[PDB]
């Protein structure tokens, strides 16, 4: 039973949502959630899994804040490394205890309180025993001795131990080099296009840029080491900025924060232009709401010119105080491109590889023949595509030049493959800043 | 590089339109002038350059042919989808001999075909309109 | 006796990079005995205040070599620190060591 | 040469079920350098002239061993395909090998 109206209101606040081209995906190192790329709507939900303190609420909170809500944010979790080690003495027959979680139907508890002479270890190399009889947990954990670590192999993935007095300690995230999390994130979903991670670190940091840049999303970083606003030329310093200009990566964001280490300023960045379309935007001069300009850590004030240029060196992005108002300036990527370029090159290749597939896979108006019909409807369905742009303000005209059927190999027919198709276009630019010299007052 | 009629080949929202009629099957026409000269009652002429370069492409393909029934599904289809949707898409004719050599910028569907049952089999003429007919050339700017 | 915060907010700035295999127990900066060529080792995020590598490192060894003990490197060229792994082994023929994990670990 | 046709009914009989690997090429002689088990393979059903695994199987490699070969063994014990892989490789110590997918074509 339901009545005729059911009416229910609160006294809660707006947020009406837009939706855009781009969901964000958080990698954090967590231990809850259903495998990895759990998901959340509101920031009511990303709270019922995770703490204040928690690095994926933090992020949550700065992404989720602004005034165009983003639709949806995808949170992975990075595979685990448990590592135990007793901290003491074993004392006589002191307990020990320890939970293993595997899947969903793991929660064996493990007791061995079995030092009546002497251990100096045994507990943990007798738990190793222990950890490979029991009939739920036998297989997927692998376990080791030291001198333990309860790492995952085979089927099963996630693993968690927990105790109370003894240790179950340390984290010692599995997921190495990007590459690792990366291949393990895809396996789940690919439908997510803007990536981030709570890590920090140098080597994985510059991991993550190198294996982003192969496949078809943008990285979001955000550093606050000192040693980047003091070098004017590229090839003298180590930091990550001038480590990303080296390499000439175009698909990582730099953005210079103060609050890079605690907090994480590149959420509210992604939110700027992620519920907008792709490409009708510029990512440059943007007021994000909330997030303070680039302070110094020395001095705790706005960052002065010298140091703002040598981050333009470096082509990380920085919060610029303009009049007094909080300016994310630049708004390009490491390797020198704008991003909004690369949001809609990448919209563009998605548009184009599904009008394409439709003809190919969905057989649209039939299979495409090897004549010059065939190459035609190819034409029509690029040209058609690249039209979109134009409409979208992004490009301002496109030339597409097919080969003629005549002059095609018979190499090509026989494999079945059309080569030798260009497009043409025109970007059409932004205004971001002028520079009025007026002439006197004469 | 002669004008052959069997050659001529036109696409459409991803379709292979064919079974064009014998007699006059295709027929572009950009619906404004490019200039309309205004002439002053003392003499001199002024120019206005029109910012209209819409046309209309008309096609005459014959009644049993399958692309009717191709066009014919696509305009249902249309009609069904929302408002915020788009209907229109570039409108390519292809001629190895450069006889024609316009393109259909943004082209939708103007007019259904007029059946004409009569003894013998009549054409259908599906009339498309456009955003910008743009004539083009081999000859680039030199 | 550092408590927990410190041991983490100290193991961050260490940052091994590689890890080179040794015969025999290395000395007080061991600079012969290296048996391995060195290779990059990606190392991860301090927690309770101990790091472990992330990847299972695989190196390839000599004929007729023994490998015993480690000595880790950071990027300056400077070695870090040093130890034996669990069991050794001798490669009569070329073949391959798998390092599962090394955890650089403070808890005692 | 075969039809399409004609190569998916021809196949369908082959049927390899048990895969085994070698040290040495087995070409003659394929019931020597028999290092491993005759572990279970499952074939799909044969399509545009082409069968694939349907899925990953593990090969426990005993210790000590050099695996450069394998054959595909079907029921009634006949080796029907042998095969190198990519590089001989020592299994120092005991392992398991991982075939991620091993697919018969007549496409050639």
């Not at chain 2, 079974?19 to 006059?24: I, K, N, R, W």
């Not at chain 3, 309770?48 to 060894?61: C, H, P, R």
């Not at chain 3, 490998?67 to 001798?90: E, I, R, Y």
Request: hydrophobic share 40%; glycine share 6%.
């Amino acid at each position: 039973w339901n009545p005729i109206v059911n009416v229910d209101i609160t006294l809660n606040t707006a947020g009406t949502t837009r939706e855009g081209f781009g969901l964000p995906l958080f990698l954090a190192s967590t231990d809850n959630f259903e495998e990895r790329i759990r998901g959340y709507t509101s920031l009511t939900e990303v709270a019922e899994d995770f703490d204040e303190s928690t690095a994926a609420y933090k992020a949550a909170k700065q992404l989720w804040s602004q005034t165009p809500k983003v639709t949806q944010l995808y949170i992975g979790r990075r595979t685990m490394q448990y590592t135990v080690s007793i901290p003491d003495t074993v004392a006589e027959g002191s307990e020990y205890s320890l939970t293993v979680a595997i899947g969903g139907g793991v929660s064996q508890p493990f007791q061995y309180t079995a030092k009546e002479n002497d251990t100096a270890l045994i507990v943990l190399n007798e738990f190793k025993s222990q950890i490979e009889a029991s009939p739920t947990i036998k297989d997927g954990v692998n376990a080791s001795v030291t001198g333990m670590i309860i790492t995952k192999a085979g089927d099963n993935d996630f693993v968690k131990v927990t105790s109370i007095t003894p240790t179950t300690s340390i984290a010692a995230t599995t997921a190495d080099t990007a590459s690792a999390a990366l291949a393990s994130i895809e396996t789940y979903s690919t439908d997510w296009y803007f990536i981030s991670a709570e890590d920090r670190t140098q080597q994985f940091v510059l991991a993550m840029a190198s294996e982003i840049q192969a496949r078809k999303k943008i990285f979001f970083t955000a550093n606050a080491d000192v040693k980047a606003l003091q070098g004017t030329d590229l090839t003298s310093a180590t930091d990550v900025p001038a480590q990303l200009a080296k390499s000439k990566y175009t698909r990582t964001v730099c953005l210079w924060h103060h609050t890079a280490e605690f907090d994480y300023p590149e959420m509210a960045y992604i939110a700027y232009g992620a519920p907008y379309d792709a490409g009708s935007i510029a990512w440059g001069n943007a007021q994000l709401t909330g997030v303070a300009a680039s302070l110094q850590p020395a001095n705790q004030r706005p960052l002065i010119s010298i140091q703002k240029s040598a981050l333009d060196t470096r082509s990380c992005n920085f919060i610029d105080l303009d009049g007094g108002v909080p300016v994310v300036r630049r708004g390009i990527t490491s390797g020198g491109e704008w991003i909004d370029i690369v949001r809609g090159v990448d919209w563009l290749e998605s548009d184009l590889k599904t009008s394409l597939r439709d003809l190919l896979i969905n057989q649209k108006g039939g299979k495409i023949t090897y004549d010059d019909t065939g190459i035609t409807r190819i034409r029509q369905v690029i040209e058609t595509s690249l039209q979109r742009a134009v409409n979208r303000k992004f490009l301002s005209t496109y030339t597409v030049t097919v080969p003629k059927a005549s002059q095609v190999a018979l190499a090509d027919k026989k494999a079945r493959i059309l080569k030798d198709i260009t497009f043409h276009g025109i970007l059409a630019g932004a205004i971001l800043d002028v520079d009025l010299k007026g002439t006197v007052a004469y | 590089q002669q004008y052959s009629p069997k050659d001529v080949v036109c696409s459409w929202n991803g379709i292979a339109i064919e079974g064009f009629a014998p007699d006059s099957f295709l027929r572009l026409q950009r619906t404004s002038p490019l200039v309309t000269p205004v002439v002053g009652a003392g003499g001199q002429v002024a120019l206005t350059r029109n910012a209209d370069k819409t046309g209309t492409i008309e096609i005459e393909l014959m009644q049993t042919s399958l692309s009717n029934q191709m066009l014919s599904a696509i305009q249902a289809k249309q009609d069904d989808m929302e408002l915020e949707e788009d209907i229109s898409s570039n409108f390519v004719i292809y001629d190895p001999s450069g006889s024609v050599l316009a393109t259909g910028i943004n082209a939708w569907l103007q007019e259904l075909p007029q059946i004409e049952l009569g003894r013998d089999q009549n054409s259908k003429t599906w009339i498309f309109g456009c955003e910008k007919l743009d004539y083009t050339s081999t000859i680039p700017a030199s | 006796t550092l408590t927990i915060d410190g041991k983490n907010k100290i193991l961050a700035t260490l940052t091994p990079t590689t890890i080179v295999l040794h015969n025999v127990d290395p000395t007080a900066d061991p600079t012969a005995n290296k048996v391995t060529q060195p290779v990059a080792i990606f190392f991860s995020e301090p927690n309770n205040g101990l790091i472990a590598s992330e990847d299972t490192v695989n190196i390839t060894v000599p004929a007729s070599a023994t490998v015993s003990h480690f000595s880790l490197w950071d990027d300056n060229s400077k070695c870090v620190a040093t130890g034996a792994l669990s069991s050794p082994q001798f490669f009569a023929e070329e073949g391959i060591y798998v390092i599962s994990s090394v955890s650089i670990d403070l808890n005692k």
